[PDB]
Amino acid sequence: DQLRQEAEQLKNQIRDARKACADATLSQITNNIDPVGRIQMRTRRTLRGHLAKIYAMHWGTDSRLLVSASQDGKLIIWDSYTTNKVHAIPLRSSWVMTCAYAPSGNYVACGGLDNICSIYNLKTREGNVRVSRELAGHTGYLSCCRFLDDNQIVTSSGDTTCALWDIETGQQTTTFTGHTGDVMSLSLAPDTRLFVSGACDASAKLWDVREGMCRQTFTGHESDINAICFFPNGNAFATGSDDATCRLFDLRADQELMTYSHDNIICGITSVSFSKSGRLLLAGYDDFNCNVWDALKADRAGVLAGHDNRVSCLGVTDDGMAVATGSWDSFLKIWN
Amino acid sequence: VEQLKMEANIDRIKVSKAAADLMAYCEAHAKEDPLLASENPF
Amino acid sequence: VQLVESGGGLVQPGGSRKLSCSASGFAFSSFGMHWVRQAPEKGLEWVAYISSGSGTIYYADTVKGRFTISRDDPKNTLFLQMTSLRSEDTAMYYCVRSIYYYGSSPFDFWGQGTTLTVSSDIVMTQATSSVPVPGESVSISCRSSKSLLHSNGNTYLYWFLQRPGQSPQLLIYRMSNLASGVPDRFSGSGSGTAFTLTISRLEAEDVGVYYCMQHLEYPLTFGAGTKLEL
Amino acid sequence: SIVIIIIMTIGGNILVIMAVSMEKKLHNATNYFLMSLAIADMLVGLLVMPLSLLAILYDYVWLCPVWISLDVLFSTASIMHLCAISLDRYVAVRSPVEHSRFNSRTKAIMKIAIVWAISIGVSVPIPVIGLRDEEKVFVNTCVLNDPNFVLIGSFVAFFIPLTIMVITYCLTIYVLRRQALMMQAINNERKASKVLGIVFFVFLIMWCPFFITNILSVLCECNQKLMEKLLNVFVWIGYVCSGINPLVYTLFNKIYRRAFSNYL
Amino acid sequence: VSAEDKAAAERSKMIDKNLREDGEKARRTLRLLLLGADNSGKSTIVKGIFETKFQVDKVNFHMFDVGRRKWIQCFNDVTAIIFVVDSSDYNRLQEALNDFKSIWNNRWLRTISVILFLNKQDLLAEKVLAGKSKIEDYFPEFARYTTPEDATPEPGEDPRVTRAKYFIRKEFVDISTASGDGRHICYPHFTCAVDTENARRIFNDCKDIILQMNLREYNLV
Ligand SMILES: CC(C)CCC[C@@H](C)[C@H]1CC[C@H]2[C@@H]3CC=C4C[C@@H](O)CC[C@]4(C)[C@H]3CC[C@]12C
Ligand SMILES: C[C@H]1CNCCc2ccc(Cl)cc21
């Protein structure tokens, strides 16, 4: 009875504090910046072999190797330059929803509705790819996983929690609680110190890996958040949701900066990704095409329309010379 | 209650400063962005 | 990872004999195999190659029409059929494992070998018979007749070390890549048709003969060999 | 005057061909065959129709020994396409689980190869005999006189496909009637019967009289003047049913209607 | 190109062949999704994710039981959905109706037919015969409902359980007829804890669905 009033007073204090810093907007300082113009991208390679909808994709650190996941129960490693296949990995469960590639190039991880994250060893003296360890402990389905090193991994699930794991022992070291809905997307900072999670409660939180405490909470969306991306400089968020709206958040101003939307878009957003320099913003939509956005002007610079179904994956190479897309039509495309 | 109190104790800066920093970062590395024939590996 | 060869013995000229090899400890069906022959006073020589899926088969220019190579995946065995043997065929035969994909090591493992007793090509050049020499630096060089640098950025030069009483062991593949299990004291560099091998600090286990090999076009060619005597 | 039917046939074949590529989202196994039938109809309209009009205008000749062969080949190809479509419809609506397992491009390619191989067999000897026997192609003036072809190839071209089509239609009607005894599930199984009946009766009406007249003009001789007068007008009915098959097989799916409305 | 690139191409071709071979077996199994609330008897209709397999007349079926706003998106390729409702508990029928409305009108299942199972008919019949609880206590409109003249009751059934059963079936079906525009069909059925014929119903409904898809494919409808 008494704590609700205190919580409301604290929320009002935070709202008043945030409003005091809104002395300018991006739409006003960028009036002296020339537009990027029209950007044309064309298909350079087409990857065939998958027999089902593609759900997950991740680039390697060498800008040549690529991993994809589909509902056929197999994981394929691609050579982007020659289209030759390198490895094919059978899965113990066919309902896979995420995949990841180790920065050292030795391991790949995946998971899904079985509530287990599995790690595969890509370099063995036998020549076969074998399972190294299975991570159990979540109660809901697994939505995303990202590597920190060969021994630490961060996972997100639909039971409102996030966790930090020790691969050597398979024991959970820190649990992150505070969400009220299913957690969809993760994004790991370049400095491997903080990570960001979006959830179905239309809120996003910044977490401290070393301490396990939530630092900031952001609001503004009207529905579930499906994708979160990280600006290269470590001080900005990029989020997508099912209300056909994208938002830009800053970790120092603690408020929204710019909104990306258009009257002709009435479909959901499935993925968000950045270029190296941060000038271009890429997003996947349910209209069977992908849009190119200007992050500093909220304009539309281009569109990719080579798919025949929903776009589910989107990624950029570390050298910035290619973009890969995935759709439910069982095809992958490399754009340049 | 505790979470809101902890979140209230944040040292904030102006939005213009963060936006100028974002613009400066975008301008600084413009020449290194290949998306913005003899060099293309594809 | 273990490779065992069988067969061999004494034969008369004009006869025939068949060789066999048993593989275990690895996924045999995913690997390609080579047979390499070494004579007492000639060095290493390439004989034949069979692909993992039995797709392509290659033979040396001195064995065409007389030698036949076959594969048996369900039994994890290799076979080499030899007919009309000559006096020049008396030598030791080795079995080598190879796998080809991006970033692989195609000459990582060598067998033990068996003994058989009877009664356009790129030239790889080495010229030193013995380098007398613990704790000192040693540099060994090789020279090729044609450039080994391909347009894709890769240079196909391989290095092997053969200790007394032991099979050749891979040290460097593609001129800069250190093989697994090798200490970091070995390094290599070069460009075009000139190549060098450098050892920072010698030990008692660094005694043997070093060989150079190219993998640009078939047939595969080996060098004369440089002996390091401590 | 009558040249209008050529323009309509060409336009319909072009519309059918275009409605498969640009529209996309079309299964190959069932829509690539319609492109082949449309191409056959277009070749009929381009290589057969304009030349008979010249003969009508002149009432004489000028040609014949290759024009006859081309007409026969393309008509046989069209009829074989219709028979193959009927057989495929029956196969797809009887045992339905298996057809779904079978559907692939290797069936469309096989069907196209078989129909085009069968179509060419009957037209090869037409110039071979004609160029070595003027009387076989000119009488008194371009008409195939030889009974050794009229009384042999006509059965293979028309009379066996007719039996196959009628048997297929009867079996399919019975199967569709039987299934409904087990609601939108029942209402949809009657429109199919209606469309099948319409298509079969259109085919039978358009193709039946000409072959009967052509057989009677040979085996019943009977005033030859009346027979040739009837053939002069019946043969154009066989030509008319080349721009109708590309339509009657098309304008019943709403997707095709929308594509035709937007394109035209 | 270099020899290693040719060997890599051969390995890629073999991998492509092995992928192509495996797809043939996948397409020969039909997939089903099972949804329902507690006490409905889901586990007995055919007796993270629970799975079961059964075969009727040389056709294999694979049924998935999860455990709904998010994971339902990955089941948009299934042949049919099975929904089970308890027909002998009047207090919770409105929840079942709301759940059916939420499943029927989902945007990701707009092309999937539904097989609807109304379970536990014996308990409903016993409750109606006992007369200790009346449907009108929760559904006022039932007092004005009359048995249709085209009803086909099972012989020996009292004409007081047929009215209730047809009332429940009507209350469920009227939602299905309000939307869909012919793209999908509902297949109501009455079942019980001891019935074994449930296997044939799924096979017949799936065959009908495939027949409808084939009829749509040939531009006949
Ligand atoms: C020249 C004419 C008569 C040839 C026409 C080709 C006919 C015979 C073809 C076209 C489609 C074919 C069917 C396509 C699918 C299958 C696969 C499997 O279920 C068994 C055979 C079956 C059912 C085929 C039988 C032959 C078939 C009916
Ligand atoms: C002589 C002709 C009449 N006109 C062209 C069509 C055609 C088709 C089949 C056959 Cl057996 C004979 C004929």
PDB file of N, CA and C in Angstrom, chain E residues 130-165:
ATOM      1  N   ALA E 130     -28.688 -37.381 -14.883  1.00  0.00           N
ATOM      2  CA  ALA E 130     -28.839 -37.162 -13.448  1.00  0.00           C
ATOM      3  C   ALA E 130     -29.698 -35.938 -13.159  1.00  0.00           C
ATOM      4  N   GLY E 131     -29.502 -34.859 -13.914  1.00  0.00           N
ATOM      5  CA  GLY E 131     -30.311 -33.670 -13.748  1.00  0.00           C
ATOM      6  C   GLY E 131     -29.984 -32.823 -12.541  1.00  0.00           C
ATOM      7  N   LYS E 132     -28.786 -32.964 -11.976  1.00  0.00           N
ATOM      8  CA  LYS E 132     -28.378 -32.161 -10.833  1.00  0.00           C
ATOM      9  C   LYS E 132     -27.770 -30.824 -11.235  1.00  0.00           C
ATOM     10  N   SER E 133     -27.562 -30.592 -12.528  1.00  0.00           N
ATOM     11  CA  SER E 133     -27.038 -29.327 -13.020  1.00  0.00           C
ATOM     12  C   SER E 133     -27.595 -29.092 -14.414  1.00  0.00           C
ATOM     13  N   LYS E 134     -27.982 -27.852 -14.691  1.00  0.00           N
ATOM     14  CA  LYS E 134     -28.626 -27.502 -15.947  1.00  0.00           C
ATOM     15  C   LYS E 134     -27.738 -26.563 -16.750  1.00  0.00           C
ATOM     16  N   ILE E 135     -27.729 -26.771 -18.069  1.00  0.00           N
ATOM     17  CA  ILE E 135     -26.914 -25.943 -18.953  1.00  0.00           C
ATOM     18  C   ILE E 135     -27.414 -24.504 -18.940  1.00  0.00           C
ATOM     19  N   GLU E 136     -28.725 -24.317 -18.772  1.00  0.00           N
ATOM     20  CA  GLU E 136     -29.297 -22.975 -18.732  1.00  0.00           C
ATOM     21  C   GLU E 136     -28.757 -22.146 -17.573  1.00  0.00           C
ATOM     22  N   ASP E 137     -28.183 -22.786 -16.550  1.00  0.00           N
ATOM     23  CA  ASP E 137     -27.570 -22.038 -15.459  1.00  0.00           C
ATOM     24  C   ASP E 137     -26.352 -21.246 -15.915  1.00  0.00           C
ATOM     25  N   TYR E 138     -25.731 -21.633 -17.025  1.00  0.00           N
ATOM     26  CA  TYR E 138     -24.616 -20.893 -17.595  1.00  0.00           C
ATOM     27  C   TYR E 138     -24.889 -20.367 -18.996  1.00  0.00           C
ATOM     28  N   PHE E 139     -25.769 -21.016 -19.760  1.00  0.00           N
ATOM     29  CA  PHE E 139     -26.104 -20.615 -21.126  1.00  0.00           C
ATOM     30  C   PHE E 139     -27.603 -20.362 -21.211  1.00  0.00           C
ATOM     31  N   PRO E 140     -28.038 -19.102 -21.127  1.00  0.00           N
ATOM     32  CA  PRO E 140     -29.482 -18.820 -21.195  1.00  0.00           C
ATOM     33  C   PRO E 140     -30.131 -19.236 -22.503  1.00  0.00           C
ATOM     34  N   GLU E 141     -29.403 -19.164 -23.618  1.00  0.00           N
ATOM     35  CA  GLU E 141     -29.987 -19.424 -24.929  1.00  0.00           C
ATOM     36  C   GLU E 141     -30.343 -20.889 -25.152  1.00  0.00           C
ATOM     37  N   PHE E 142     -29.888 -21.802 -24.292  1.00  0.00           N
ATOM     38  CA  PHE E 142     -30.165 -23.219 -24.502  1.00  0.00           C
ATOM     39  C   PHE E 142     -31.635 -23.565 -24.303  1.00  0.00           C
ATOM     40  N   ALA E 143     -32.364 -22.789 -23.498  1.00  0.00           N
ATOM     41  CA  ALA E 143     -33.779 -23.064 -23.278  1.00  0.00           C
ATOM     42  C   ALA E 143     -34.608 -22.893 -24.542  1.00  0.00           C
ATOM     43  N   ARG E 144     -34.131 -22.103 -25.502  1.00  0.00           N
ATOM     44  CA  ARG E 144     -34.849 -21.853 -26.744  1.00  0.00           C
ATOM     45  C   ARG E 144     -34.330 -22.701 -27.896  1.00  0.00           C
ATOM     46  N   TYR E 145     -33.385 -23.599 -27.634  1.00  0.00           N
ATOM     47  CA  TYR E 145     -32.805 -24.440 -28.670  1.00  0.00           C
ATOM     48  C   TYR E 145     -33.625 -25.712 -28.836  1.00  0.00           C
ATOM     49  N   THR E 146     -33.814 -26.120 -30.087  1.00  0.00           N
ATOM     50  CA  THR E 146     -34.552 -27.327 -30.424  1.00  0.00           C
ATOM     51  C   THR E 146     -33.681 -28.218 -31.297  1.00  0.00           C
ATOM     52  N   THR E 147     -33.864 -29.525 -31.163  1.00  0.00           N
ATOM     53  CA  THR E 147     -33.095 -30.472 -31.963  1.00  0.00           C
ATOM     54  C   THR E 147     -33.464 -30.324 -33.436  1.00  0.00           C
ATOM     55  N   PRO E 148     -32.489 -30.207 -34.336  1.00  0.00           N
ATOM     56  CA  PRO E 148     -32.817 -30.068 -35.759  1.00  0.00           C
ATOM     57  C   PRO E 148     -33.452 -31.333 -36.314  1.00  0.00           C
ATOM     58  N   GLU E 149     -34.297 -31.145 -37.331  1.00  0.00           N
ATOM     59  CA  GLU E 149     -35.009 -32.265 -37.936  1.00  0.00           C
ATOM     60  C   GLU E 149     -34.091 -33.184 -38.732  1.00  0.00           C
ATOM     61  N   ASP E 150     -32.879 -32.738 -39.057  1.00  0.00           N
ATOM     62  CA  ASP E 150     -31.924 -33.541 -39.807  1.00  0.00           C
ATOM     63  C   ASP E 150     -30.933 -34.260 -38.901  1.00  0.00           C
ATOM     64  N   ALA E 151     -31.186 -34.284 -37.596  1.00  0.00           N
ATOM     65  CA  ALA E 151     -30.303 -34.979 -36.672  1.00  0.00           C
ATOM     66  C   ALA E 151     -30.326 -36.480 -36.935  1.00  0.00           C
ATOM     67  N   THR E 152     -29.191 -37.126 -36.678  1.00  0.00           N
ATOM     68  CA  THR E 152     -29.046 -38.573 -36.830  1.00  0.00           C
ATOM     69  C   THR E 152     -28.493 -39.144 -35.531  1.00  0.00           C
ATOM     70  N   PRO E 153     -29.318 -39.223 -34.485  1.00  0.00           N
ATOM     71  CA  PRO E 153     -28.843 -39.787 -33.219  1.00  0.00           C
ATOM     72  C   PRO E 153     -28.548 -41.274 -33.340  1.00  0.00           C
ATOM     73  N   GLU E 154     -27.609 -41.735 -32.521  1.00  0.00           N
ATOM     74  CA  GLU E 154     -27.333 -43.158 -32.438  1.00  0.00           C
ATOM     75  C   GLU E 154     -28.542 -43.882 -31.850  1.00  0.00           C
ATOM     76  N   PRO E 155     -28.883 -45.063 -32.366  1.00  0.00           N
ATOM     77  CA  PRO E 155     -30.036 -45.796 -31.827  1.00  0.00           C
ATOM     78  C   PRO E 155     -29.864 -46.096 -30.345  1.00  0.00           C
ATOM     79  N   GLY E 156     -30.961 -45.960 -29.601  1.00  0.00           N
ATOM     80  CA  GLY E 156     -30.968 -46.204 -28.176  1.00  0.00           C
ATOM     81  C   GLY E 156     -30.627 -45.005 -27.319  1.00  0.00           C
ATOM     82  N   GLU E 157     -30.157 -43.916 -27.917  1.00  0.00           N
ATOM     83  CA  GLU E 157     -29.825 -42.719 -27.161  1.00  0.00           C
ATOM     84  C   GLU E 157     -31.088 -41.952 -26.790  1.00  0.00           C
ATOM     85  N   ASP E 158     -31.168 -41.540 -25.529  1.00  0.00           N
ATOM     86  CA  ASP E 158     -32.294 -40.737 -25.082  1.00  0.00           C
ATOM     87  C   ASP E 158     -32.262 -39.369 -25.760  1.00  0.00           C
ATOM     88  N   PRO E 159     -33.418 -38.823 -26.148  1.00  0.00           N
ATOM     89  CA  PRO E 159     -33.411 -37.526 -26.834  1.00  0.00           C
ATOM     90  C   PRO E 159     -33.259 -36.356 -25.876  1.00  0.00           C
ATOM     91  N   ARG E 160     -32.340 -36.484 -24.921  1.00  0.00           N
ATOM     92  CA  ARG E 160     -31.951 -35.389 -24.052  1.00  0.00           C
ATOM     93  C   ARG E 160     -30.449 -35.158 -24.023  1.00  0.00           C
ATOM     94  N   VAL E 161     -29.647 -36.146 -24.406  1.00  0.00           N
ATOM     95  CA  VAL E 161     -28.214 -35.939 -24.547  1.00  0.00           C
ATOM     96  C   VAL E 161     -27.874 -35.439 -25.945  1.00  0.00           C
ATOM     97  N   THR E 162     -28.652 -35.845 -26.950  1.00  0.00           N
ATOM     98  CA  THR E 162     -28.418 -35.374 -28.311  1.00  0.00           C
ATOM     99  C   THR E 162     -28.580 -33.864 -28.401  1.00  0.00           C
ATOM    100  N   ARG E 163     -29.577 -33.315 -27.704  1.00  0.00           N
ATOM    101  CA  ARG E 163     -29.778 -31.870 -27.718  1.00  0.00           C
ATOM    102  C   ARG E 163     -28.564 -31.143 -27.148  1.00  0.00           C
ATOM    103  N   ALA E 164     -28.038 -31.620 -26.017  1.00  0.00           N
ATOM    104  CA  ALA E 164     -26.865 -30.986 -25.419  1.00  0.00           C
ATOM    105  C   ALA E 164     -25.634 -31.124 -26.309  1.00  0.00           C
ATOM    106  N   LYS E 165     -25.416 -32.315 -26.875  1.00  0.00           N
ATOM    107  CA  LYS E 165     -24.250 -32.527 -27.725  1.00  0.00           C
ATOM    108  C   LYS E 165     -24.300 -31.641 -28.959  1.00  0.00           C
TER     109      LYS E 165
END
